Structure formats: C-alpha cells, structure tokens
Design an enzyme around this catalytic site. Structure first.
Site, PDB file in Angstrom:
ATOM      1  N   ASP B 256       0.849  -1.207   0.000  1.00 27.12           N
ATOM      2  CA  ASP B 256       0.000   0.000   0.000  1.00 27.12           C
ATOM      3  C   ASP B 256       0.881   1.252   0.000  1.00 27.12           C
ATOM      4  OD1 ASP B 256      -2.367  -1.535  -0.045  1.00 27.12           O
ATOM      5  OD2 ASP B 256      -2.375  -1.665   2.182  1.00 27.12           O
ATOM      6  N   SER B 297       3.459   3.562  10.147  1.00 25.57           N
ATOM      7  CA  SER B 297       4.838   3.361   9.633  1.00 25.57           C
ATOM      8  C   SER B 297       5.126   4.209   8.383  1.00 25.57           C
ATOM      9  CB  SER B 297       5.081   1.876   9.368  1.00 25.57           C
ATOM     10  OG  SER B 297       4.515   1.423   8.136  1.00 25.57           O
TER      11      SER B 297
HETATM   12  O1  LIG Z   1      -2.441  -4.234   2.603  1.00 25.75           O
HETATM   13  C1  LIG Z   1      -2.655  -4.174   4.042  1.00 25.75           C
HETATM   14  C2  LIG Z   1      -4.142  -3.951   4.366  1.00 25.75           C
HETATM   15  O2  LIG Z   1      -4.928  -4.996   3.794  1.00 25.75           O
HETATM   16  C3  LIG Z   1      -6.012  -5.296   4.666  1.00 25.75           C
HETATM   17  O3  LIG Z   1      -7.091  -4.775   4.007  1.00 25.75           O
HETATM   18  C4  LIG Z   1      -5.784  -4.597   6.017  1.00 25.75           C
HETATM   19  O4  LIG Z   1      -6.828  -3.681   6.411  1.00 25.75           O
HETATM   20  C5  LIG Z   1      -4.419  -3.956   5.847  1.00 25.75           C
HETATM   21  O5  LIG Z   1      -4.365  -2.629   6.340  1.00 25.75           O
HETATM   22 NA    NA Z   2      -0.878  -5.075  -1.367  1.00 24.15          NA
HETATM   23 NA    NA Z   3       5.201  -1.176   8.507  1.00 28.78          NA
END
Ligand SMILES: OC[C@H]1O[C@H](O)[C@H](O)[C@@H]1O
Ligand code: NA
Ligand code: NA
Ligand SMILES: Nc1ncnc2c1ncn2[C@@H]1O[C@H](COP(=O)(O)OP(=O)(O)CP(=O)(O)O)[C@@H](O)[C@H]1O
Ligand SMILES: Nc1ncnc2c1ncn2[C@@H]1O[C@H](COP(=O)(O)OP(=O)(O)CP(=O)(O)O)[C@@H](O)[C@H]1O
Ligand code: NA
Ligand code: NA
EC number: 2.7.1.15
Lengths: 317, 311
Positions: B256, B297
């Site tokens: 993410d 983080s």
């Molecule tokens: O990629 C990590 C995320 O995937 C899941 O959806 C959790 O909520 C987490 O924050």
């Molecule tokens: Na991911």
């Molecule tokens: Na992290």
C-alpha cells in the site's frame, strides 16, 4: 457491602469472524460476519455467579484502552464490583481473536495482554475483599504465580478455593492441587493433566482419582451432555451426575456457566450436598448451551425454575 | 485546492495479533501483542500519497459506529478530503483481523462491512473531482462493479488509472485489465490471477507478461525484499528494480505504501521514467517495513531524502 464470591482471573475481548473456510499461511480471505463479545474465563464465571444473585468482585487487569473501558462497564452492568479491576497503560486489554468456518471448526489467537500484568502487589491491595469472601475462583488465563498467590491468600483466610485448570498444561505446579478445595475441569483438560483417555463416566472416575491423589479435596470432571463426575477425599468412589437431553444451540462458555453456578452454590447454599449443587450447576449450564453468545446465554434467576433456589434438597428442576 | 489523487476504495480497522507461529485448524495459540490500527488498502494508499504531499480525496463508506467516527478523524488528520467519505447505519466499519508470526508471514480475515455499501450513486457525486484528478486508485476491497465504474469515469476524463487487484480473485472481470493504465500486485496475487508459481524475479516476469497480454498498459509485480519487476506494452521485457536493503519489523501494508508512492509520482512527477518512479517508490515502501503497523509506519516528505522530490 461484602462480596461472597471473588474471582481472580481473566477478562478478554472476543473478536469473532465467521468465514466459509479457515485461511492458510499468507492468505487474505473474506468473512461474512464480525462481532465483539465479552469473554475471559474469569469474567464469564463471575457473570454467571452474579446473574444467579451472588454479590461478586472481579479482581483482574485490563488496558487503558476503549476495550478495557467497555469491559469495566460490562462488569458494572452485571452488578459485579470493579474495586480491584485495574487498568494499565503497559498493555492492551486481553483479546481472543476467533475465526470460525461454516462447519464450526476454528482457529483462536489469544493475547493475554493486561491479564498477565495482574501481580502479587495488586492482590495485596485486594486482600480485604479476598479474605472476607466465601469462595475464591481462579483459572489458568493469568500469570500462574498470581493464581497461586490468590489460592494461598484464600486458604490462609479460610475462604473456599474453586480452581478451574483451564486451559490445561501437562506439568502443572503441584501446589494447584494441594491449594484446591474444589478442582473442576473438562474431559480434554483431564486428558492433558493425566495422559488418560476420558470416553465414559467410568474413565472420568479413573482420571478424577489420579487428580484426587495429587492432593485435591474435591475433583469434578464435566462431560458436556453426559453431565459430570465427582469424587472427594471423604467420598473417593466417583459418582456420575447425568443431565437430561436438551437441544444445544451453542455450548461456548458452558464450563464457565457451570463453574460460576457452582461458586454461587458454595457461597450461598453451603449445606446442600455436593451432588445437589452439581445437579443444579448442570441445569444452569444446560440453559446456557440452548442460546448463542457466551455471557449473553447465561440465565438470570428470573429465567430459571425457583426449585434451583430452594434451601433444602430438590432433584428435578 | 484541486485533489490530484482520488482513491475509490476501502477503510478497515486493523485488529492485529503478533505470535511466534500461525495456528492450524482446531488450534488455540498465545501471541505476545495485540494492537488496533487504521487500515484498508484504499485508505493506506491514500495516506501514503497524502504524506508525500499529494492533495487527495478518499471516496469510501464507513459505519456510523465508533470505529467509523475514528476513521473520519484519521483521514482529516492526514489532510485527506472526506467530501465523499460516507457513513451508513446499515453496516459496521470494515474489520481486518491480522495474525503475524515472528518471521513476518500473516493470515488476514476481512469482513468488509460498510465498504460493500459504497455504490455507483455514491460515485456520481464525486464525478467533478474524478474528472479534475491526475490519478484514480482502486483495489478489490469494495464491490468490484463500483471500482470498475470509478476506472470507467477516470478513463472518460483521461485520468490515469492505477489498479491494485488486492486481495486477488482467480476469475477477475477482464475489464480490470483493459481499464488499467498501471496494474500493480504482489507475488501471491500474481499467482492467484495467472495460476502460475511466482518463486523468483524471472517467474514474476512470466506472470507479468500473462497480465500484459490481458490488456494492461503497464504491469508491476512487487517482490517484498527483492523490490519489483515492471513491463509495458512499449517495453514488454521485464526490468527488475531492487529496493533499499533494510531491517524489516512489520511489512503489513508495504505494498500500500508502494502504490501510494506510485500514485504520488504519476500525479506530480508524470515525466519521470517508470524505472525512476519505482526506484523512489521502493525506497518509500522500504521505510514503511522498518516500523509497526500500516499507516503509523508511512513516512512523511520531511523525513525522506530531498532527492526523492527532485526532477
Ligand atoms: O495491505 C494491508 C491492508 O490490507 C487489509 O485490508 C488490512 O486492512 C491492511 O491494512
Ligand atoms: Na498489497
Ligand atoms: Na510497517
Ligand atoms: N450438550 C449439552 N447438553 C446439556 N448440558 C451441557 C451440554 N454441553 C455442556 N453442558 C453443561 O456444561 C457443563 C460443561 O460442559 P463441557 O464439559 O463441554 O465443558 P467446556 O465448555 O469447558 C468444554 P470446551 O472448553 O471445549 O468449551 C457440563 O458439565 C454440563 O452441565
Ligand atoms: N523486506 C523488505 N525490505 C525492503 N523493502 C521491502 C521489504 N518488503 C517489502 N518492501 C517494499 O515494499 C514493496 C511491497 O512489498 P510486497 O509486495 O511484499 O508488499 P505486500 O504488503 O503487498 C505483500 P503481502 O500482501 O503478502 O503482505 C516492495 O516492492 C519493496 O519496495
Ligand atoms: Na471450561
Ligand atoms: Na451458549
């Protein structure tokens, strides 16, 4: 003013996810339901005793977090004293994260958290409540040394000790037996403690006798739908206390209902035979298995037949 | 005051248990730590982009519950527009139960709740903001048809589409490929989408080529500590872009961080090569794995080398 039933043990937030299958390592899966429930063996036992009419006090530690604040309010809503319910910034409120599939198979991750920080200083400050109770209840969900000190304090005060070795570990400190007035566990816990198989009332009798000889005064093995088996130093021949067929909806926390009922009877009906107390305890735990939701399923006096509250012997409820 | 990065996707409360091993069927294990975090792939991506200096808008649905109220405050604290952050009493804020072992491997159980109530009517109100954005970001934590409509709206205005097929579905609608300008997933998601094994940068190259042929313009497969591999219609030869060599404490939401950095560079540094952008995006994601949680983080611009913001 004075609590007759003191529970020194665990409060845990139940974080429950229902899924079609359980996940493998590295997997993200979609569940279809999530819900938050109030659990921990200590609190569950305390709640059932309180709902039957006991004056109870819950000696435990939760976090200085929202889950901890909600837990304290849960205990006050069940009319449980929170005088020595401690809150600590040093860990989160205990959690039981439960993933349950369609067939009812589960994985459980317990983080005892603040439960493990309940220490001997915390018990000394609670010493007035512990020493003046009729019954002290403990399990194996906090620090073992803390449960042993609670049992020691109760024994030297002439308070009755009810110990639930749950979850069980094979090489339990021998003092848990010698400090137990009443030692109450289920079939699988009896297997872990003795290495013996429990597939019948007769097998439960044999396991209970091993536990009695390690120094317990009374040993009770719960047998789900088969009721329970009991023996004692004064009556070492085991007795089977059966329970009528009912339609079980959800047995989760049945053992905690049974133990909280037994604490209530030891504290408020001390002159009943032990078998009468266990017959009543079976009926109350069997009411719990007929509804969902652990603490939500634990009946109040108003929901139970009045024969469970008679001062003399009564068999059929 | 125009939002350059619009994220149509998920918010979740992360309920995280750290343990020494993962449990098998029937097993109770004792972990050593429990913590709550703001999560969801959509919000995580939006937060990383916002912290790098992007003007962002989060199109999502949460509950009219404590967790949802807390989520809206979280988005405002990260200076994310909540114009199209909706609340519903008909479903709880999304939950992700996350179990992480001491080697960093996890299991995740998502109950999407209010995420699945974000519908095409909720998108229509955001039409103006989507048409004025540089980048539209979507994942697979809301109703697929809602992500497909967000990508369709973005394509109509010439807005760049960044799609993260996470968590992955073996039968993904073919339009997710043809609507994706940049299609970014990890090794295990690539396995689920292609039915191939991904045990090396070379294997990831082969999976990326299968994804390119389904009609993606650009495919990026993230490889944890090995960085990422990228290919494109113009340059279909896979390129391996290594990442910063760091000590990983918690890799949750690393992808993410990577995707939010990618959104930030597509929106604000559009003339950088893909290799340059992924060099930078790897560095930022590698900062995230050095500390606990997802969003907690994610580094801010002020804490990162100046050279990440030069061109
Ligand atoms: O990629 C990590 C995320 O995937 C899941 O959806 C959790 O909520 C987490 O924050
Ligand atoms: Na991911
Ligand atoms: Na992290
Ligand atoms: N199916 C059933 N029908 C009637 N009573 C039941 C029952 N299951 C449980 N009980 C009651 O609850 C008591 C405890 O049940 P059990 O032995 O299953 O303990 P438990 O809940 O500790 C096992 P576990 O730890 O797996 O949930 C029994 O002795 C009985 O009184
Ligand atoms: N151990 C590590 N060291 C340095 N950087 C890392 C790293 N693990 C991840 N990263 C960075 O984060 C990016 C994303 O990694 P990865 O694909 O593993 O994330 P992820 O969160 O999507 C996998 P999963 O869903 O299985 O947890 C990588 O491309 C890399 O830049
Ligand atoms: Na039990
Ligand atoms: Na029940």
């Amino acid at each position: 003013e004075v609590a007759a039933v003191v529970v020194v043990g665990s409060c845990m937030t139940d974080l429950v996810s229902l899924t079609s299958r359980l996940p493998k390592t590295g997997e993200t899966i979609h569940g279809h339901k999530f819900f938050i429930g109030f659990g921990g063996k200590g609190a569950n036992q305390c709640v059932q005793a309180a709902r039957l009419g006991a004056m109870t006090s819950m000696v435990c530690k939760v976090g200085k977090d929202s889950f901890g604040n909600d837990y304290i309010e849960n205990l006050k809503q069940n009319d449980i004293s929170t005088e020595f319910t401690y809150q600590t910034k040093d860990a989160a409120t205990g959690t039981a994260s439960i993933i349950v599939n369609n067939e009812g198979q589960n994985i459980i991750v317990i983080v005892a958290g603040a439960n493990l920080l309940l220490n001997t200083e915390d018990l000394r400050a609670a010493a007035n409540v512990i020493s003046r109770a009729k019954v002290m209840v403990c399990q194996l969900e906090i620090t073992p040394a803390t449960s042993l000190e609670a049992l020691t304090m109760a024994r030297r005060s002439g308070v009755k000790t009810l110990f639930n070795p749950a979850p069980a570990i094979a090489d339990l400190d021998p003092q848990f037996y010698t400090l137990s007035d009443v030692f109450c566990c289920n079939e699988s816990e009896a297997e872990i403690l003795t290495g013996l198989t429990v597939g019948s009332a007769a097998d439960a009798g044999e396991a209970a006798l091993v536990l009695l000889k390690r120094g317990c005064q009374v040993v009770i093995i719960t047998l789900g739908a088969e009721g329970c088996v009991v023996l004692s130093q004064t009556e070492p021949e085991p007795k089977h206390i059966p329970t009528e067929k009912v339609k079980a909806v959800d047995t989760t926390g049945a053992g905690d209902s049974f133990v909280g009922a037994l604490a209530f009877y030891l504290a408020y009906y001390p002159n009943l035979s032990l078998e009468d107390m266990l017959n009543r305890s079976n009926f109350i735990a069997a009411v719990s298995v007929q509804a969902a939701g652990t603490q939500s399923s634990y009946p109040y006096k108003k929901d139970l037949p009045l024969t469970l509250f008679l001062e003399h012997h009564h068999h059929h409820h």
